[PDB]
Write a protein that binds this ligand. Structure first.
Ligand SMILES: [Zn+2]
Lengths: 609, 76, 321
């Protein structure tokens, strides 16, 4: 698998979630909340209720979505599951990564935890589930540990949900297989295969003893199951669409549910008739976490597709149950602020600038090469702005863009990274008073990204990238190899890791400075009426207009200045049956001549006048 | 943008393309996943066989489009 | 007023003759071609030549014989560099080229009758169907629907099956996962998704093209698939549509272009057609009546016990009228 260098255009600190929360985890001992972000960052908050800013810290090791989080070891020890295919163990009090399990092969979608037996399992699109002892991971002793990876087999389809009971005697998985699979974590023995659901199961819940199970699926139903009776015991149709998040009280009598329809409901499992509309969120519910300080729970924490996290009070259930649908809460008691997510982006024909639109509808102009914002256009019409800022030039694709963090992430690949060769003056890099060379954008950018790396000694000579710019090195298919900040390239152990992970295709150009040649283009040239066999050797780096002057030398059968005079009357190198501007690059003709319903070899028109 | 190709076994594969991408290039991308050389490949879309000289925009092949990959059975 | 005349092989043009024969016994196509011949624009192109050939076949004093498609082939070679040779070719590539070329000619004529939004020619009226592709993201479940036209369906095959089964697997839901994940515009990231292709608009004639080939990545070559694939004489299809009107139309098999040969690089094409209830075999210049039971069997060879594999490659189903 080939390796790709990528970086994120962002601020030094991203205090608020930039793409919504997938999973929630509350610590009652220290009154701290944990949000897992789609922006790949876990954040810690103080839910004391009285503080102008609850932001404590942010944990950034992951490079993709954080699907689930688990708070273990009687207080604080966060485990995370991510779409970067890795599982990370964190010292939750001090907030840093300890170990990274790279056992999973695909996105890691869910985690289950057995408090008592202090056990934890991880599953994803791997179709494989992995059991882990929290104590064994947290260990720093390594006294003949010989870590044995214990997997769970059976899952035919991709797993989206996992649940384990308190005692850790039962473990059930939910997948696109619609069927739930149960096992005994202590023995790894297959228990049963509960058939019943119509669709994928995204939420699973087990009782203390693991006797009965609650499940939520995209079929719109909540199913109660008895593992004793070994079959479904009940089905509640509460939502008018998929149900993705569930929480229960300690009694295991009242179930809390939400999903796509954005409505949050509490439902009495005993008497399904009793169904209270808690709220209607501003976006589909992705995950919920109850406040378990009191029974019944005083409040519920709600994570959605939006970056904002909300708390809704459940204190008044009892009074509404006896008397008299109309929802309980209209406004949240406490709101965790959210940032904006970039949902639309457009690369301009100059492949240096990017236009973006975000969830607040704010449009902004960006410079990929200098990895920074340039201007905030505000809530302007995005497609109209795109048109207005149209440049009639062509520059080959040299990078890709992703927005899965809600932030701009630019990715460079071995293939097309080096492809865009533009003049410096064009690139706005005036060099008074010598000449303008043909610079490679991807090259310069690579140099700037690894500017502080000593192996490349300096910079690129033209520009600098923000020193806090994260530089990620990763396999295209999935697995993340190494993430460091640009400024950190200096560190001896960092430079040692760059030495070990940075692939050869980058080494050739940044350190060894063996800059790549160009990849020439050619086209047929002849008179449109008369003149007195094959395309001449040419390049997109050529000014195109200068080649038309060479045609005037054949009619003749200090000279460089006389050839420029031919452009005033002769030459006339038209193409695609239309007039061709001398300032236009040879590469730009491919975006108009051959692009207009014709073969990639269009002949150049020529005339005496 | 992303388009789809239905391969010989009926398996669907994805391709990341641009409207300016030519058909030969697309066949090269198919070749990267399946290994079939472009000279052996034939692509049918919307009832029409795609020409190597033409581009995706020319055939108006937009996102989520499914292309049908087929090879050849020669006879005389 | 029926006739049965074979076509001369001009070296490796059996693929041509076979497709022309299959198309000739597609009555609405034949009829539209004859109606085209009657207007006499008197300019030469592939359609006028085709019309001349079909008219010559239909209007012959005897009932049986052999006709040389010299002028048609001359035009085919003239307007297409690709078939301008004596090499062996694919019947489906030819079929598709011919249908699109004629249809393009007709479009240009509609465009030039108005001269003194888009329209549809009779080629589309006969062979064109429409599919609806639906992709559902498993993360947010936002189903995305896209309509796409077709002139024929290319179906993947498996050992010891029926074309009805292949057709049903074709319309089965497929999960896009791992390296093939779908890019969801809501999730703004690649996700597992469910893909299903259902028939939205049924064609007058359903042409089925069997993907009888397999690529060996490790061996850098492909082989011909000579699997047994039974094709029934009749087929029933149901329509989706807007569910205001819902179809359940019956089709009958009328013709099969068959490829004979052990490999994909060489072979021979023949055509079987149904006429007034019995089956006939066209092998270039030779035509013979064959009994109905023998046509299942050789087409889709069992095991290996058969000389130079003769397998059905393109089938033509005619809607009941
Ligand atoms: Zn989605």
């Amino acid at each position: 698998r080939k390796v790709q260098v990528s970086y994120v255009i962002r601020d030094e600190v991203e205090k608020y979630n930039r793409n919504g929360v997938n999973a929630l985890q509350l610590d009652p001992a220290l009154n701290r909340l944990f949000t897992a972000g789609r922006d790949s960052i876990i954040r810690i908050w103080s839910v004391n209720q009285h503080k102008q800013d609850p932001y404590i810290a942010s944990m950034e090791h992951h490079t993709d979505w954080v699907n689930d989080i688990v708070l273990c070891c009687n207080g604080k020890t966060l485990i995370s599951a991510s779409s970067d295919t890795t599982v990370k163990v964190w010292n939750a009090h001090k907030g840093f990564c300890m170990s990274t399990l790279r056992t999973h092969k695909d996105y890691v979608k869910a985690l289950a935890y057995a408090k008592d037996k202090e056990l934890v399992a991880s599953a994803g699109l791997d179709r494989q589930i992995f059991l882990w002892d929290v104590n064994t991971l947290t260990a720093l002793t390594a006294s003949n540990n010989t870590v044995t990876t214990s997997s769970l087999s059976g899952n035919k389809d991709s797993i989206y949900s996992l649940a384990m009971n308190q005692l850790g005697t039962i473990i059930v998985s939910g997948s696109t297989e619609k069927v739930l699979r149960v096992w005994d974590p202590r023995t790894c023995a297959k228990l049963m295969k509960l058939k019943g659901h119509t669709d994928n199961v995204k939420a699973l819940l087990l009782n203390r003893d693991g006797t009965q199970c609650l499940s939520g699926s995209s079929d719109g139903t909540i199913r109660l199951w008895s593992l004793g009776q070994q079959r479904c015991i009940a089905t509640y149709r509460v939502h008018d669409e998929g149900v993705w998040a569930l929480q229960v009280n300690d009694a295991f009598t009242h179930v809390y549910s939400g999903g796509r329809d954005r409505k949050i409901y509490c439902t009495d499992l005993r008497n399904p008739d009793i169904r209270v509309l808690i709220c209607e969120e501003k976006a589909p519910v992705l995950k919920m976490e109850l406040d378990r300080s009191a029974d019944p729970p005083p409040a519920i924490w709600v994570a959605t597709t939006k970056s904002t996290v909300n708390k809704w009070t459940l204190k008044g259930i009892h009074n509404f149950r006896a008397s008299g649908i109309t929802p309980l809460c209209t406004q949240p008691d406490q709101v965790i602020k959210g940032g904006a997510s970039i949902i639309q982006c457009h690369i301009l024909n100059d492949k240096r600038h990017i236009l973006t639109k975000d969830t607040n509808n704010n449009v902004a102009y960006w410079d990929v090469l200098k990895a920074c914002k340039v201007e905030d256009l505000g809530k302007v019409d995005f497609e109209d702005e795109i048109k207005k800022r149209f440049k009639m030039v062509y520059v080959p694709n040299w990078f890709s863009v992703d927005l899965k963090t809600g932030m701009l992430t630019i990715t460079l690949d071995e293939s097309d990274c080096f492809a865009a060769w533009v003049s410096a003056k064009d690139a706005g890099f005036s060099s008074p008073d010598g000449s303008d060379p043909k610079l490679n954008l991807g090259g310069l950018l690579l140099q700037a990204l690894l500017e502080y790396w000593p192996r490349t000694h300096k910079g690129n000579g033209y520009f600098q990238v923000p020193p806090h710019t994260p530089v990620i090195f990763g396999e295209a298919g999935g697995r993340t190899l190494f993430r460091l900040l640009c400024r950190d390239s200096g560190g001896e152990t960092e430079s040692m890791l760059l030495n070990e992970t940075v692939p050869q295709w980058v080494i050739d150009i940044t350190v060894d400075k063996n800059m790549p040649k160009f990849x020439x283009x050619x086209x047929x040239x002849x008179x449109x009426x008369x003149x007195x066999x094959x395309x001449x050797x040419x390049x997109x780096x050529x000014x195109x207009x200068x080649x038309x002057x060479x045609x005037x030398x054949x009619x003749x059968x200090x000279x460089x200045x006389x050839x420029x005079x031919x452009x005033x009357x002769x030459x006339x190198x038209x193409x695609x049956x239309x007039x061709x501007x001398x300032x236009x690059x040879x590469x730009x003709x491919x975006x108009x001549x051959x692009x207009x319903x014709x073969x990639x070899x269009x002949x150049x028109x020529x005339x005496x006048x | 943008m992303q388009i789809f190709v239905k391969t010989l076994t009926g398996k669907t594969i994805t391709l990341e393309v641009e409207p300016s991408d030519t058909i030969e290039n697309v066949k090269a991308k198919i070749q990267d996943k399946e290994g079939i050389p472009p000279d052996q490949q034939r692509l049918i879309f919307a009832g029409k066989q795609l020409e190597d000289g033409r581009t995706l925009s020319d055939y108006n092949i937009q996102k989520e489009s499914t292309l049908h990959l087929v090879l050849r059975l020669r006879g005389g | 007023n029926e006739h049965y005349f074979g076509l001369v092989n001009f070296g490796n043009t059996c693929y041509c003759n076979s497709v022309l024969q299959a198309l000739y016994f597609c009555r609405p196509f034949r009829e539209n071609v004859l109606a085209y011949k009657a207007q006499q624009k008197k300019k030469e192109n592939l359609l006028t030549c085709l019309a001349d050939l079909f008219h010559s076949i239909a209007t012959q004093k005897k009932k049986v014989g052999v006709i040389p498609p010299k002028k048609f082939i001359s035009r085919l070679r003239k307007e297409n560099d690709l078939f301008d040779n004596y090499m062996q070719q694919d019947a489906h590539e030819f079929l598709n080229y011919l249908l699109n070329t004629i249809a393009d000619i007709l479009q240009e004529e509609k465009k030039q009758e108005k001269q003194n939004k888009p329209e549809l020619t009779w080629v589309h009226e006969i062979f064109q169907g429409t599919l609806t592709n639906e992709t559902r993201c498993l993360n947010c479940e936002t189903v995305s629907s896209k309509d796409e036209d077709f002139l024929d369906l290319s179906v993947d095959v498996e050992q010891n099956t029926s074309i009805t089964h292949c057709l049903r697997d074709f319309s089965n839901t497929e999960t896009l996962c791992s390296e093939q994940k779908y890019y969801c515009e809501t999730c703004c990231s690649k996700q597992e998704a469910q893909k299903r292709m259902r028939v939205k608009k049924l064609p007058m004639i359903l042409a089925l093209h069997l993907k009888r080939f397999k690529y060996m990545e490790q061996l850098h070559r492909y082989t011909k698939l000579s699997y047994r694939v039974v094709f029934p004489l009749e087929l029933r299809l149901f329509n989706t549509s807007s569910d205001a009107v819902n179809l359940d139309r019956m089709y009958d098999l009328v013709a099969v272009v068959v490829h004979c040969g052990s490999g994909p690089n060489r072979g021979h094409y023949i055509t079987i057609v149904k006429s007034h209830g019995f089956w006939l075999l066209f092998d270039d210049d030779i035509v013979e009546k064959i009994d109905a039971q023998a046509i299942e069997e050789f087409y889709g060879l069992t095991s290996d016990i058969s000389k130079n594999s003769e397998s059905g490659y393109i089938l033509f189903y005619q809607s009941r009228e």
